[PDB]
């Protein structure tokens, strides 16, 4: 259920701010970072919400005014859409699918321009939606540098070390409008997802649900995203979406969600909850083990399938020949 | 049409000795080895019957009496069946499919034992069928050595050299009963198929008909054989068998059929034509080219599909997991 805020502020959010979907879910555990069970979940690459890491404690004071005053004069990537769904797409792959027309568009702008566009949308009551999604880099102003340095590196560096992960590759700053949705997808890195402002409902699905979630082809710009429209699922094309079962939580300021590598996740900013702010922490996964144990884990089979698709696209010299060859291999032979 | 034998012997065979099938065919060209068109067909890896190679001229005098007197005291592999279909199967793969029960069985015996079993079947009017299929080796007696040495090595060595083929790997001696059928399959070597006694109807299908002919999985004992029962084709499982088109010929004594690598072939000993004798000449194909041209040839796509199946069987640690992974890759994604 919704957590009750300290100082008798009442529930932070209520069930009416969540979107309605076709599948059941069960809760992700919420634990203290000092809890042995939390350590066990991370070690076993299962999701857990940690409530008291202080991972981004200096950033809890961030709002638009503070950020605009201090985040510098760099360019920020801002996506715009006329739908609540901000489906990720890879611009380098759009040459493979000249028919793909994205529903959101990216515009580079300064942070004050982003705040002003937000304001102009609000005052005008327009329906346009904005989602800022920008890697934190060395153009940020001095106060953001000091905040960043004050993150809990002691705790997260120990996690990286304990799990055998590779390097931190980036920190993504995410600033969304109430009701924004990032559709279900999986990432090939480990993720500590640090909520700063507002509330996000996070629905995760394990790597073993691949067959229920129908990712796009690897060569498609929406590689790693589910083809299924969660708001209107097409059960004739995606019949096993009727078997999907999620793991759900709502994170608020101060919470950190461990999103394990390969785990599907659907993320939404609560309806009528105001803007949301998140900083994630992406780490490369640990090296492949010396001794492979059989049978393989689900995420290892996912990796195999990605590599088969990549190899065939390269070998056939044309991504579009991958599907026809796979169908020929299987029809009347394996199905 | 049937060739007319020299000395006014009439047609060697008639259309009534051919089995009836569901697909159309067109004829394989019959040419002289001196014909530039024959050289062009071989170079382009298309089938051709050569009528005057003298490839196995010393063996044209072979019959059972001669062979039994001279072929030595080695063991010969003899397959037995209660059906006319001698479907090839790989005994080393039978551990992958404990449910596979072959319809023919192999027995090792001396050549005179094979002749005597033939005779006992004849006199008794039984329905058992025998097919001898034995690699020629150094146990053969002296007269067979002299015959073998008198094959036209000058001509076939020049072919090997001109085509860039690798080594001769073996010569298979095939002795069948009238009406025996080897079901459709392809071989991964180049083949000069030298007819010695009796007549065989040879139906070939190009490598581009893979999708009409439904080979077994690579790990199955009948790897490289069509799953389709040509006598009773199951069009619900194998719908593209309704699109198959063959290239047909009947070879008799003195003829050589070039069966190019990867080409499907169905081979039958004519009904009521007596026993048949063939010696084939298997050569490894030429190395893979330095510069791959795109798009790939059909046989190159066949090679890719075999290697994908082999890799997945090895990577998943279990052949039986190959089909499920391929289906998961494709369903709702590529089909």
């Amino acid at each position: 259920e919704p957590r009750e805020e300290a100082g008798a502020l009442g529930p932070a959010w209520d069930e009416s701010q969540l979107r309605s979907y076709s599948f059941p879910t069960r809760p992700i555990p919420r634990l203290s970072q000092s809890d042995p069970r939390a350590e066990e979940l991370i070690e076993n690459e299962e999701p857990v919400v940690l409530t008291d890491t202080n991972l981004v404690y200096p950033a809890l004071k961030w709002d638009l005014e503070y950020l605009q005053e201090n985040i510098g004069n760099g360019d920020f990537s801002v996506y715009s859409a006329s739908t609540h769904k901000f489906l990720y797409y890879d611009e380098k792959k759009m040459a493979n699918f000249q028919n793909f027309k994205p529903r959101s568009n990216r515009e580079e702008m300064k942070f004050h321009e982003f705040v002003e566009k937000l304001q102009d949308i609000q005052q005008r009551g327009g329906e346009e939606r904005l989602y800022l999604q920008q890697t934190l880099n060395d153009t940020v102003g001095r106060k953001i540098v000091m905040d960043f340095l004050g993150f809990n590196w002691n705790w997260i560096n120990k996690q990286q070390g304990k799990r055998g992960w590779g390097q931190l590759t980036s920190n993504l700053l995410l600033i969304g409008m109430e009701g924004n949705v990032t559709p279900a997808h999986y990432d090939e890195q480990q993720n500590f997802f640090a909520q700063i402002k507002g509330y996000k409902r996070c629905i995760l699905f394990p790597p073993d649900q691949f067959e229920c979630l129908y990712p796009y082809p690897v060569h498609h710009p929406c590689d790693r995203q589910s083809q299924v429209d969660f708001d209107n699922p097409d059960y004739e094309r995606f019949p096993n979406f009727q078997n999907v079962v999620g793991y759900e939580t709502v994170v608020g300021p101060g919470d950190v969600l461990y999103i394990p590598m390969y785990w599907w996740h659907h993320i939404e900013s609560l309806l009528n909850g105001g803007i949301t702010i998140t900083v994630n922490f992406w780490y490369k996964g640990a090296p492949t083990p010396k001794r492979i144990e059989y049978p393989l884990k689900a995420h290892q089979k996912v990796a195999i399938m990605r590599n088969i698709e990549k190899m065939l696209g390269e070998a056939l010299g044309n991504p579009q020949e991958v599907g026809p060859l796979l169908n020929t291999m299987i029809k009347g032979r394996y199905n | 049409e049937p060739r007319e034998e020299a000395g006014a012997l009439g047609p060697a065979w008639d259309e009534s000795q051919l089995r009836s099938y569901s697909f159309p065919t067109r004829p394989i060209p019959r040419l002289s080895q001196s014909d530039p068109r024959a050289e062009e067909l071989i170079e382009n890896e298309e089938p051709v019957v050569l009528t005057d190679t003298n490839l196995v001229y010393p063996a044209l005098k072979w019959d059972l009496e001669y062979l039994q007197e001279n072929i030595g005291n080695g063991d010969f592999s003899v397959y037995s069946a209660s059906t006319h279909k001698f479907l090839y199967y790989d005994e080393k793969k039978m551990a992958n499919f404990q449910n596979f029960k072959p319809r023919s069985n192999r027995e090792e015996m001396k050549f005179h034992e094979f002749v005597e079993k033939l005779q006992d079947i004849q006199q008794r009017g039984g329905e058992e069928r025998l097919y001898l299929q034995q690699t020629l080796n150094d146990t053969v007696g002296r007269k067979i050595v002299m015959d073998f040495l008198g094959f036209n090595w000058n001509w076939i060595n020049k072919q090997q050299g001109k085509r860039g083929w690798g080594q001769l790997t073996s010569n298979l001696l095939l002795i069948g009963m009238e009406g025996n059928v080897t079901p459709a399959h392809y071989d991964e070597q180049q083949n000069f198929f030298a007819q010695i006694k009796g007549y065989k109807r040879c139906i070939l299908f190009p490598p581009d008909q893979f999708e009409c002919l439904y080979p077994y999985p690579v790990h199955h004992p009948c790897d490289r054989q069509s799953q389709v029962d040509f006598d009773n084709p199951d069009y619900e499982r194998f719908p593209n068998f309704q699109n198959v088109v063959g290239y047909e010929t009947v070879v008799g004594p003195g003829d050589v059929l070039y069966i190019p690598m990867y080409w499907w072939h169905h081979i039958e000993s004519l009904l009521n034509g007596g026993i048949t004798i063939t010696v084939n000449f298997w050569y490894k194909g030429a190395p893979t080219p330095k510069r791959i041209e795109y798009p790939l040839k059909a046989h190159q796509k066949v090679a890719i599909m075999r290697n994908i199946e082999k890799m997945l069987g090895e990577a998943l640690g279990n052949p039986q997991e190959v089909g499920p992974l391929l289906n998961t890759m494709i369903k709702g994604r590529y089909n």
Partner: peptide
């Protein structure tokens, strides 16, 4: 070492970078 080759992980994520 075909298995090691095939289970090699990528590192793609939903990042603009």
């Amino acid at each position: 070492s075909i298995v090691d080759f095939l289970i090699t992980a990528g590192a793609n994520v939903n990042s603009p970078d």
